[PDB]
Amino acid sequence: QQIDQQIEEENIRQQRKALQREIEDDVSKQREIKGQLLAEEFERE
């Protein structure tokens, strides 16, 4: 039974990555939004 659950302990060490993927979305959006907004700043002059 301990081995059965020793394996589960590793199964659980194996959500952070999906948040990491999200981290990159956060980065891309803000980076590109700054460019979109500067393009808007000119359009809005």
Of 26, 10, 6, the residue nearest 18 (C-alpha):
26
Which approach determined this entry?
cryo-EM
CA angle 35, 40, 42 (to 5 degrees): 105
- SS3 for the chain is CHHHHHHHHHHHHCCHHHHHHHHHHHHHHHHHHHHHHHHHHHHCC
